Amino acid sequence: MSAKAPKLFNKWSYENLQTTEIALSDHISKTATYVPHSAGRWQKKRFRKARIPIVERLTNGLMFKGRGNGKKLQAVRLVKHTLEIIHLLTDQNPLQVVIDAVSKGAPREDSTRVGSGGVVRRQAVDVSPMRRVNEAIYLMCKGAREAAFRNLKTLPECLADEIVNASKGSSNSYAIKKKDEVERVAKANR
C-alpha cells in the first residue's frame, strides 16, 4: 500500500486544492495521475474535453512549431521544473496556483463583429466556461515561447513567472492585459 488510495504528482497533493471560482467547476477538475502525459483519446464529443484537469490540457497545448520538437515527453520535463519553481516562490503547493491563474487570466466578457449594413456592430457577449479555461491556457503558454524566442536566458522559468503574476492579477502576465483591454471595450459599449 501507500500508492493505492494516495495520489500524488510525486510529492504534490490534491487534498489542499480547492476550485477558486464557482463559475468554473465542471471545466476545472483535479489531477490524480503522476504525470500529465497523455495516451488516451481526448476528443470525440462536444464536451468530453472537460472530463480531465487543466494540467493535462495545458501541458499538451504548451508549445507547437515543430522542427524536430520532442512533443509530450519533452513538455513533461519542463512541467517538473516549473512546479518546483512556483512552489518555492508562492511558498505554497504549485498545483493550486495553476488552478487560480487559469481562472484569473481568462477574459470573462468579449465583444464581436456581428453587425451588417456594410458596417460592424459590437455587443457585450459573455464568455462561456470552457472558453475561459481554453483561452487563458493558450495566452499564458503563447507568452512563454515569445519570452525565450531570442530573449532572456530562461528555459522553464518564464512559465513559473507568468503563472505567478497571473494569479496575482498583476499586468506583467500576457494573459492579464488581454482580459483588461477586452473588458474596456465590452463594458464601455453594449
Binding site: 463559475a23 462536444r46 464581436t112 462561456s128 470552457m130
Partner: protein, 68 residues
C-alpha cells in the same frame, strides 16, 4: 469586477449566423432571495454552452439582441 453566477436554464435557441455565437438564457441563482424582477436575463455567449453550466456575469439587465 462583479462575478455573479447564473445557471443556464435552457438553450434559448440559435441567434447569430457566424457559427460562433449563440444566444442563451441565464437564470440568477446569485440571489439569496433579494428582489429581482428581471428575473431571467437573455445573454449572448461566446463558444459552446450546455444546460446547468454556471458562469460569471460582468453585467446585469441585459436584453441581448434588442432591435440592433
Amino acid at each position: 469586477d462583479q462575478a455573479q453566477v447564473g445557471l443556464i436554464i435552457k438553450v434559448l435557441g440559435r441567434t447569430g449566423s457566424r457559427g460562433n455565437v449563440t444566444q442563451v438564457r441565464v437564470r440568477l441563482m446569485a440571489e439569496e432571495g433579494s428582489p429581482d424582477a428581471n428575473r431571467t436575463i437573455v445573454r449572448n455567449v461566446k463558444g459552446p454552452c450546455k444546460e446547468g453550466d454556471m458562469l460569471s456575469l460582468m453585467e446585469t439587465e441585459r436584453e441581448a439582441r434588442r432591435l440592433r
